[PDB]
Amino acid sequence: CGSVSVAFPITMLLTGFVGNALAMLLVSRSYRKSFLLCIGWLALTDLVGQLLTTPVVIVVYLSKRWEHIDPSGRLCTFFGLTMTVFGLSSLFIASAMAVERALAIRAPHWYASHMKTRITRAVLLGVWLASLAFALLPVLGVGQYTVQWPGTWCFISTGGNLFFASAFAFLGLLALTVTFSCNLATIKALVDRCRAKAAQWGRITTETAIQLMGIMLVLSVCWSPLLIMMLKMIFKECNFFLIAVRLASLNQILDPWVYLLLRKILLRAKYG
Amino acid sequence: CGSVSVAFPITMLLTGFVGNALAMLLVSRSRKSFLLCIGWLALTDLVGQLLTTPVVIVVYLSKRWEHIDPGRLCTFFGLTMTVFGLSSLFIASAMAVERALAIRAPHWYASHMKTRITRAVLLGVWLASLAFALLPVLGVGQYTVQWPGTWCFISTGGNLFFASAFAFLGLLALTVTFSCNLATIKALVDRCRAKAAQWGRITTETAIQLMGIMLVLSVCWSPLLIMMLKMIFKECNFFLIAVRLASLNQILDPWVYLLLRKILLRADLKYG
Ligand SMILES: CCCCC[C@H](O)/C=C/[C@H]1[C@H](O)CC(=O)[C@@H]1C/C=C\CCCC(=O)O
Numbered sequence: 001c002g003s004v005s006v007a008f009p010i011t012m013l014l015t016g017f018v019g020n021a022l023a024m025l026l027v028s029r030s031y032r033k034s035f036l037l038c039i040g041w042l043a044l045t046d047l048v049g050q051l052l053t054t055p056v057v058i059v060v061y062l063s064k065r066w067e068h069i070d071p072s073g074r075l076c077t078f079f080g081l082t083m084t085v086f087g088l089s090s091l092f093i094a095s096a097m098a099v100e101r102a103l104a105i106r107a108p109h110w111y112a113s114h115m116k117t118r119i120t121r122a123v124l125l126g127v128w129l130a131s132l133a134f135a136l137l138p139v140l141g142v143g144q145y146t147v148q149w150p151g152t153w154c155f156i157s158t159g160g161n162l163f164f165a166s167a168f169a170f171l172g173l174l175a176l177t178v179t180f181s182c183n184l185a186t187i188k189a190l191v192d193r194c195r196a197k198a199a200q201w202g203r204i205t206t207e208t209a210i211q212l213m214g215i216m217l218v219l220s221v222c223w224s225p226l227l228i229m230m231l232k233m234i235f236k237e238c239n240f241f242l243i244a245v246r247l248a249s250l251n252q253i254l255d256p257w258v259y260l261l262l263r264k265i266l267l268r269a270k271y272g
Numbered sequence: 273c274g275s276v277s278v279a280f281p282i283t284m285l286l287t288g289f290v291g292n293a294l295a296m297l298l299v300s301r302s303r304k305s306f307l308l309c310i311g312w313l314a315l316t317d318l319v320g321q322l323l324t325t326p327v328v329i330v331v332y333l334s335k336r337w338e339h340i341d342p343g344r345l346c347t348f349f350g351l352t353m354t355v356f357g358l359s360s361l362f363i364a365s366a367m368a369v370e371r372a373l374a375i376r377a378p379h380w381y382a383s384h385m386k387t388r389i390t391r392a393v394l395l396g397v398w399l400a401s402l403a404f405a406l407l408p409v410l411g412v413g414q415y416t417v418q419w420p421g422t423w424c425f426i427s428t429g430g431n432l433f434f435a436s437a438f439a440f441l442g443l444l445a446l447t448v449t450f451s452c453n454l455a456t457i458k459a460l461v462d463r464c465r466a467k468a469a470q471w472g473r474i475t476t477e478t479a480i481q482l483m484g485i486m487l488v489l490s491v492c493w494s495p496l497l498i499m500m501l502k503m504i505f506k507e508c509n510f511f512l513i514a515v516r517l518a519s520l521n522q523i524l525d526p527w528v529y530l531l532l533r534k535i536l537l538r539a540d541l542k543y544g
C-alpha cells in the first residue's frame with residue numbers, strides 16, 4: 001500500500017493551484033496577443049479541474065468506504081465525468097496551440113494581420129463543449145464510471161463500456177499526434193530561416209526549439225502510461241493504474257511552467 | 273506502509289534540483305551581497321540533496337541497510353543530514369540579521385558592507401555545522417538506521433545530549449530569524465507612515481517577503497524539532513513525515529528568496 005497515501009493529492013492540489021494562479025496573474029497584467037489569451041484560459045482550465053476533483057479524494061482518505069459515503073453512486077458519476085472533461089481539454093487546447101505556432105511561422109505576414117481574438121474564443125469554447133459531450137456518454141448509456149482502487153477515485157470502467165474506454169484512449173493518442181507533428185514541423189521551419197540568414201537571430205531559434213521539445217517531453221512522459229495501460233486492459237494491475245492517472249494529472253500541474261512561468265524566470269548566407 | 277514509497281525521494285530530488293539550479297543561474301547572471309548569499313544558499317541546498325537522496329533510492333529499489341552497509345555509509349548519511357540541515361537554518365538566520373541592520377542604517381550599510389564579510393559568514397556557518405556533526409564520530413552521539421530502514425539520523429533513544437543540542441540549535445535559528453523579521457517589518461512600516469504609491473508599494477511587498485520566510489520555516493522545521501524533544505524526554509511513522517517536512521524547506525528556499533520575486537517582477541507629503 002505504498003501508493004495509498006493522502007500526501008499525493010494534497011501535494012498535487014497545492015502545486016497545481018500556485019502554478020496556475022501565477023500564470024493567470026501574469027496574463028491579466030499583460031494583455032486582455034492571442035498566445036497570452038490561450039495560455040490564460042488553459043491555466044484556468046487546469047485549476048478548475050483540480051478544485052473539482054482533489055477535495056473529494058481527500059475526504060475519502062480522512063474518513064476511512066466510497067459506497068457508504070456515496071449511496072446510489074451520485075458522486076462517482078460526477079467524479080469520472082470531471083476527470084474525462086478536463087483531461088481531454090488540456091490535451092486538445094495544447095494541440096490547438098501547436099497548430100497556431102505552425103501556421104504563425106509558416107505565414108507571419110498573414111498571421112500578424114488577420115489573427116483575431118474572436119477565433120481564439122471559438123477554439124477554446126469548441127474544445128470545452130466537445131469534451132463535455134464525450135463525457136456525457138456514460139450518463140446516456142454508452143459507457144460507465146466505476147470506483148477504482150483503492151476506493152478513493154472514479155474513472156472510466158475498462159472491464160458499450162469497452163468501446164467508450166477505447167474512444168477516450170485514441171482521442172488522447174490523437175492529441176499527442178497532432179501536437180508532436182506540428183512541433184517538429186515548426187522546429188524545422190524555424191531552423192531553415194536561421195540557416196538562410198547566416199547572435200540575435202540564431203539565439204531566438206534555439207530558445208524556441210527548446211520550448212517546443214519540452215512540451216513533447218512532458219506530454220509523452222505524463223500521458224503515455226495511462227493511455228497505453230487502458231489499451232492493454234480493454235484487450236499490481238490496480239496499483240500501476242493509480243500511478244498512471246497520477247502521472248496524467250501531473251501534466252496539468254506542469255502546464256503553467258512549460259508555457260509561461262519558465263520563460264519568465266529565464267527572461268532577460270552581432271546581428272547574426 | 274503509506275509513507276514507505278520511493279515516489280517521495282525521487283520527487284523531492286527533481287524539484288530541489290530545478291529550483292536551486294534556476295536560482296544559481298540568475299545570480300551568476302546578475303558576482304550586491306544579498307544576491308551572493310542567495311546564490312551560495314541554493315548551492316548548499318543542492319549539494320545536500322545530491323549527497324543524500326541517491327542513497328535512499330538505492331535502498332528502496334534493492335529491497336536491508338545492514339546487508340548493503342556492513343555502518344560506514346550510515347554514519348556518513350547522518351552527518352550529511354546534520355550539516356546541511358543546520359547550514360540552511362543559520363544561513364537564513366544570518367540573512368535575517370542582514371535585513372535588520374540594513375533598514376536600521378541604510379546610510380552605513382550601503383557604504384561599509386563588503387563581499388568579504390559575506391564570504392566570512394557563509395564560511396563560518398559551514399565549518400561550524402560540520403564541527404557539530406563530527407561529534408558522533410568522536411564518541412558524543414550516535415547515528416542509527418531509522419524506520420523504515422531507508423535513512424539514518426541522530427538516535428533519540430551521550431546520545432540524549434547530542435540529540436538535544438541539535439534541537440535547541442534549530443529553535444535558536446528560528447528564534448533569531450523570527451525576531452529580526454518582525455523587527456524589520458515594524459521598522460519598515462513606521463518609515464512608510466512618516467513620509468505619508470511607490471513608497472508604500474515597496475513596504476508591503478517586503479513585508480509579504482519577510483512573513484513568507486517565517487511561515488515556511490515554522491511549517492517545515494517545527495514538527496521535527498519538537499518531536500525529537502518529545503522522544504528524548506506511530507512513533508516511527510510520524511518521524512519520517514517530520515524529516516520529509518524539514519527537507520521540504522530546502523526545496524522551497526530558492527522560491528521564497530529569489531524565484532517568486534522574478535515571476536512577479538514588474539506626514540512629509542504619485543511618489544507617495
Ligand atoms: C485522467 C486524469 C485527468 C485529471 C485532470 C485533473 O486536473 C487532475 C486532478 C488530480 C490532481 O492532481 C490532484 C488529484 O488528486 C486529482 C485526481 C487525480 C488522481 C486521483 C487519484 C486518487 C488517489 O490519490 O488515490
Ligand SMILES: CCCCC[C@H](O)/C=C/[C@H]1[C@H](O)CC(=O)[C@@H]1C/C=C\CCCC(=O)O
Nearest residue numbers: 281284320321325353357422423518519522
Ligand atoms: C534534517 C534534514 C536535512 C536534510 C537536508 C537535505 O536537503 C534533504 C534531503 C532529502 C531530499 O528532500 C530528498 C531525501 O530523501 C533526502 C532525505 C530526507 C529524508 C529521508 C527520508 C528517507 C525516505 O524517504 O524513506
